[PDB]
């Protein structure tokens, strides 16, 4: 009864050393090597001494079919680069072969990515940790019976379905620059999962996430979307993130939180057009962490891999409440972080097309929808 919701949190961290060897193909922006860069960087910072590190299991087809269809999972187990010709029609109906190519060990990559998220949720359900971290997860675009946006198996939906075994209401927050369409779609008609996505909107992948998309049926008003423009910075992002999340916590009152920390919302991303720094990005982890709820932190987007390693290393230290110096320690990828070799980055001179009046107007309309909750 003496608890006040403070103190350092117990953090469990999931990582498989084989994740960095999976290769999407020549010229493909998604590079699972960024996860190994992140792991090696936080190891050289000494963060392994403050958290428990687990190697996730390979999620089975049964675990994946808790959401995905049997036909789509069977296709993922069978498709390989040496038999693509025989599956020419199946590759098209499941949206595999372009943005989501076939590569060696594709199904194993999905198992390692998904295994970390479901094992994190199990660890949270058993009340054996405060936070669970899986940077290989967060693949928020995967649909029930098709791939999308470099994502094949939606580890988030499976991890949330695992949390729903013991938690009445689960909150999902998506700070990836892209709309969390796969997660929102899976829980669009239920009030047991509330999805909140902040993203660039307007002539941008995936094309969903309009302000007026608020859910359907029993899930109406349980889907929140904050459409943004190019060039948003730390001050403008933090001006709306904390008050929006605070009101969601007050109205919805979840018992568990899932935070997708897509790094492609950082300044200088290969595919992103935002202007956030690592501190402004990590500020979102600080806000969610204050509420002292079972929190599952996941990865996601991020295609300037040197900044992805920076972002997820610092956000792990933030989860551990460990201050780390800005001078990067030596690591196996020290040359990737030139020419400064610092941990934190600086924003660009790009224009912030999100005026302060625009941010205040979108926030006010979201507050109207949040008033419609019991």
């Amino acid at each position: 009864a003496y608890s006040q919701g403070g103190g350092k949190k117990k953090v469990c961290y999931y990582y498989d050393g084989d994740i960095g060897n999976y290769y999407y193909g020549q010229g493909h922006p998604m590079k699972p090597h960024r996860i190994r860069m992140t792991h090696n960087l936080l190891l050289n910072y000494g963060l392994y001494r403050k958290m428990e590190i687990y190697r996730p299991h390979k999620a089975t087809a049964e675990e994946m079919t808790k959401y995905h269809s049997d036909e789509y999972i069977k296709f993922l187990r069978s498709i390989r680069p040496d038999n693509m010709s025989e599956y020419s029609k199946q590759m098209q109906r499941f949206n595999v072969g372009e943005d989501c190519p076939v590569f060696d060990g594709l199904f194993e990559f999905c198992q390692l990515s998904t295994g970390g998220s479901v094992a994190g949720a199990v660890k949270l359900n058993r009340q054996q940790t405060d936070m669970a971290v899986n940077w290989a997860g967060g693949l928020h675009h995967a649909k029930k019976s098709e791939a999308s946006g470099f994502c094949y198996v939606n580890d988030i939906v499976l991890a949330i379905l695992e949390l729903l075994k013991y938690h009445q209401r689960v909150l999902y927050i998506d700070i990836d620059i892209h709309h969390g369409d796969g997660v929102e779609e899976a829980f669009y008609t239920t009030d047991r999962v509330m999805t909140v996505s902040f993203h660039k909107y307007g002539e941008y992948f995936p094309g969903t996430g309009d302000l007026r998309d608020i859910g359907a049926g029993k899930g109406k008003y349980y889907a929140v979307n904050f459409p943004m423009r190019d060039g948003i910075d730390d001050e403008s992002y933090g001006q709306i993130f904390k008050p929006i999340i605070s009101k969601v916590m007050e109205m919805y009152q979840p018992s568990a939180v899932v935070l997708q920390c897509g790094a492609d919302s950082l300044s200088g991303d290969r595919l992103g057009c935002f202007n956030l720094t690592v501190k402004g990005h990590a500020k979102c982890v600080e806000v969610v962490k204050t509420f002292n709820l079972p929190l599952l932190m996941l990865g996601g987007g991020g295609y300037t891999i040197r900044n992805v390693a920076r972002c997820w290393t610092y956000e792990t230290a933030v989860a551990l409440d460990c201050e780390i110096p800005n001078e990067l320690p030596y690591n196996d990828y020290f040359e990737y972080f030139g020419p400064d070799f610092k941990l934190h980055i600086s924003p660009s001179n790009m224009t912030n097309q999100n005026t302060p009046e625009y941010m205040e107007k979108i926030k006010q309309r979201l507050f109207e929808n949040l008033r419609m909750l019991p």
Binding site: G27, P29, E98, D99, G149, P206, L271
Partner: peptide
């Protein structure tokens, strides 16, 4: 997703 290729 990728502006360099396709529609995603």
């Amino acid at each position: 997703x990728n502006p360099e290729q396709x529609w995603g």
